Amino acid sequence: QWALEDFEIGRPLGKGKFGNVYLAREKQRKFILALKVLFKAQLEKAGVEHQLRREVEIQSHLRHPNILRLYGYFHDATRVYLILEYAPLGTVYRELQKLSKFDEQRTATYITELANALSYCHSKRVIHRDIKPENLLLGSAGELKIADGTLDYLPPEMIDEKVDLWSLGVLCYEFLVGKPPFEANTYQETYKRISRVEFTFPDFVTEGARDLISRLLKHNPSQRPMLREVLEHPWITANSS
Numbered sequence: 001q002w003a004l005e006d007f008e009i010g011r012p013l014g015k016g017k018f019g020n021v022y023l024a025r026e027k028q029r030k031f032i033l034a035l036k037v038l039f040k041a042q043l044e045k046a047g048v049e050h051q052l053r054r055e056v057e058i059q060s061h062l063r064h065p066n067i068l069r070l071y072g073y074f075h076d077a078t079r080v081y082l083i084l085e086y087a088p089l090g091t092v093y094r095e096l097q098k099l100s101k102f103d104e105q106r107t108a109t110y111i112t113e114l115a116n117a118l119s120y121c122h123s124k125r126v127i128h129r130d131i132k133p134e135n136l137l138l139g140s141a142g143e144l145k146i147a148d149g150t151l152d153y154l155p156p157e158m159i160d161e162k163v164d165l166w167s168l169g170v171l172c173y174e175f176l177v178g179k180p181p182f183e184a185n186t187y188q189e190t191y192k193r194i195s196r197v198e199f200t201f202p203d204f205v206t207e208g209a210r211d212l213i214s215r216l217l218k219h220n221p222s223q224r225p226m227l228r229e230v231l232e233h234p235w236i237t238a239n240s241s
C-alpha cells in the first residue's frame, strides 16, 4: 500500500533519463533505500512506459547478491516511484572515471560477480540486452550489483543467452583498458568495428586477460564460452577474490 508520505526523503543520489534518485528512509520499518522517481510524461514521450512494466515485473522476482533488488513500487497522476536497494558506493562507471582503469584483481572480481548474476539469470530464462558500466552499482562492501552511445555494448548479432558473454568481454576490456574495445569517432565506424570484431590490446594487457577477452569477443555466438568456463578460467581464478 505504498505512498510518498511513507518516506523521509534525503539527498539526491543522481539524475537519470526520466527523473531523480533520492536517498530515503522508511518511517515505518526504518529501512534505508533509494527512491527512484520517474516522470510519466517523459516515459510516455520516449515510449518506454511499456517496457517499464515488463522490466519491473521481472526485476521484482530476481533474488541474488549481485542483482539490485526492487522492493516495491507505486505511482500517482504524474510519476512512478521505484523502491530500490540502495547501493552506497555509486556506479562502476563513475569508479572507472575516478580510477582510470581497474587492476586485474578488481577486474577479475567484478567479472566473477557479473558471471554469477548472469548464471542466475540464465537459470530463470532471463536475458539482458546490454550491460554497461552506468548500469552497474556498488554495494556497501564494494560488491557489484546489476541495475539495468549504447552502440559500444551491442553484439554483432543485435546490430540467445550468448549475448551476455559478449557483454562480459566488452566489460572485461573496458575495465582493464579504460575504453570500450570498439570505440570510434562515429556511429558508422563503431558499427563496422563491432561487426568485424576489430579490437587491439595496449601493451599492459597480460596474456591471460587477452585470452579471455578474445574467447568472449567471438563474432559468432555459438563459439562464445559457457558462463561456467568464464568462472573457471585460469586468469579469472588466478586474480579473483
Ligand SMILES: Nc1ncnc2c1ncn2[C@@H]1O[C@H](COP(=O)(O)OP(=O)(O)O)[C@@H](O)[C@H]1O
Binding pocket: 013, 014, 015, 016, 017, 018, 019, 020, 021, 034, 036, 068, 084, 085, 086, 087, 088, 090, 091, 134, 137
Ligand atoms: N539503487 C541505487 N543506489 C544508489 N544510487 C543510485 C541507485 N539507482 C540510481 N542511482 C543513482 O542515480 C543515477 C542515475 O539514476 P538512473 O535513473 O539509474 O540513471 P538512468 O535512468 O539514466 O540509467 C546513477 O548514476 C546512480 O548514481
Ligand SMILES: Nc1ncnc2c1ncn2[C@@H]1O[C@H](COP(=O)(O)OP(=O)(O)O)[C@@H](O)[C@H]1O
Binding pocket: 026, 031, 032, 033, 071, 072
Ligand atoms: N533494506 C531495505 N529497504 C527497504 N525495503 C526493504 C529492505 N529490505 C526489505 N525490504 C522490504 O521488505 C519486504 C520483504 O522483506 P525481504 O527481507 O526483502 O523479503 P524476504 O524476507 O521474503 O526475503 C519487501 O517487499 C521490501 O519492500
Ligand SMILES: Nc1ncnc2c1ncn2[C@@H]1O[C@H](COP(=O)(O)OP(=O)(O)O)[C@@H](O)[C@H]1O
Binding pocket: 025, 032, 086, 088, 140, 141
Ligand atoms: N539512518 C540512516 N540514515 C541514512 N543512511 C543510513 C542510515 N543507516 C544506514 N545508512 C547507510 O545505508 C547503507 C546501508 O546500511 P547498512 O546495511 O546498515 O550498512 P552495512 O551494509 O555497511 O552494514 C550504509 O551506507 C549506511 O551508512
